[PDB]
Amino acid sequence: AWKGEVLANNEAGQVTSIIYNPGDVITIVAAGWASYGPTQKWGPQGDREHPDQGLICHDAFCGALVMKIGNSGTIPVNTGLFRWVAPNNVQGAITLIYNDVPGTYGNNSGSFSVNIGKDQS
Amino acid sequence: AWKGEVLANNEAGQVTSIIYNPGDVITIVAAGWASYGPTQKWGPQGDREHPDQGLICHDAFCGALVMKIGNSGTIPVNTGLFRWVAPNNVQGAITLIYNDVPGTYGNNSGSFSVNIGKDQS
Amino acid sequence: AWKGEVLANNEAGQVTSIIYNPGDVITIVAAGWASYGPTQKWGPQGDREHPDQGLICHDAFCGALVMKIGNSGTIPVNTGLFRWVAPNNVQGAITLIYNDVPGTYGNNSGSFSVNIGKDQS
Amino acid sequence: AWKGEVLANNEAGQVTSIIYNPGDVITIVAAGWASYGPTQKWGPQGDREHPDQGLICHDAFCGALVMKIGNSGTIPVNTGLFRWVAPNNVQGAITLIYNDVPGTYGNNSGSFSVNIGKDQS
Numbered sequence A, B, C, D: 001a002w003k004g005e006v007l008a009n010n011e012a013g014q015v016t017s018i019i020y021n022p023g024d025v026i027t028i029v030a031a032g033w034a035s036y037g038p039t040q041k042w043g044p045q046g047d048r049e050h051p052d053q054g055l056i057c058h059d060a061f062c063g064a065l066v067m068k069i070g071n072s073g074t075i076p077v078n079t080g081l082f083r084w085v086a087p088n089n090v091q092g093a094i095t096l097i098y099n100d101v102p103g104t105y106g107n108n109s110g111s112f113s114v115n116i117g118k119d120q121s
Ligand SMILES: OC[C@H]1O[C@@H](Oc2ccccc2)[C@H](O)[C@@H](O)[C@H]1O
Pocket: A036, A037, A038, A050, A051, A052, A053, A062, A100, A101, A104, A105, A107
């Protein structure tokens, strides 16, 4: 299992010790407060009112927690995933990333505390 | 395992099929948007800016997801609990509740979708 | 989870720390060598050649590992149970017992090492 | 998870759908009756009285259930493994094999029914 912090201004994202393999079932739980710029902070679901201006993940709100698995595209994580299986041909190290527009992570603040574990299969 | 919705205006809370027994390890993941009154909506961590005016759970923000286990006091759930063990002498059916002041649930809106499962022990 | 030894000459059986509750999924793995009398020893499946002369469990061979859950009748365990769910209205402490005829445990020898854990549910 | 039969006369062994990956925790439960030649049959622990005459696994009795993981040497399985982690650098498909001397599987009989699952990690 892995636990650690995902910083909102970390554009490269946070690499974890979790390698997703074919057939794996995982659970993620994310908590905390972060901002993509404004003084206000939002949870792992991000800001439902902010327009998408080039987010690294178009299937999640700005300020949401997302992930990449290996060299997959971004996958929404939000508050977490419950006993979750990946799409086919998706595998590799899990990296957690704050959802923001590339080149605009500089003014971000806060972080998400995240737990990841593999479940029974 | 249990999955279902928890309505923000449900003052009595949502009873689940999960009976927490001594020694049990559980995982909860909660998602969605709700409000304790304002047009704005918040995630299961609630509104970090709103003052506590008599919340059923003083250890969580207004609009947060909380729970009771049997006849326990309220316990913060927020975005969820990862492989979580209860305090001693805590057991019984799990009821999920929106965190608001008693008597003020009438103007709430939205809901949280919640997964609960028992883990390896 | 529980791990411990189950002595073949223990007529009362070995009480474990495991309380089976409704809905629980459990895994048991048993290993080792024991005898109901003869110099030969058998594994947790017991002696397939020996006639049943009043075994505490008629659904298992003499010398097999069995269990009671609460005040249930004996249930065959043998080499173990994989992600196993009990019949309805069966619950309580798990006690492991060597399968022999009541009053004839005195000449038994050896033991089984057993692991019991609760599984994801 | 995987369930299936392992034939005693199958010298090449039974390939499973389980790929053991680094970090994986697995549970195996094996049951049934088989023989390496004699009319008598033995459980997954094999025959404790029979001398080793060139067994594919020298750390288990003749007639015992063993396995290979990828290109590993044979690993004793016996009645099963409980929440088990492999040695370092061991990974790949799990193949279950009856422990006998190479070239002598022809007169074997019976089979073991085996369950394999990945556990919480
Ligand atoms: O959409 C992503 C961008 O949102 C801006 O925040 C805004 C706040 C109000 C109006 C427009 C952008 C941030 O300042 C910028 O860094 C980037 O994150």
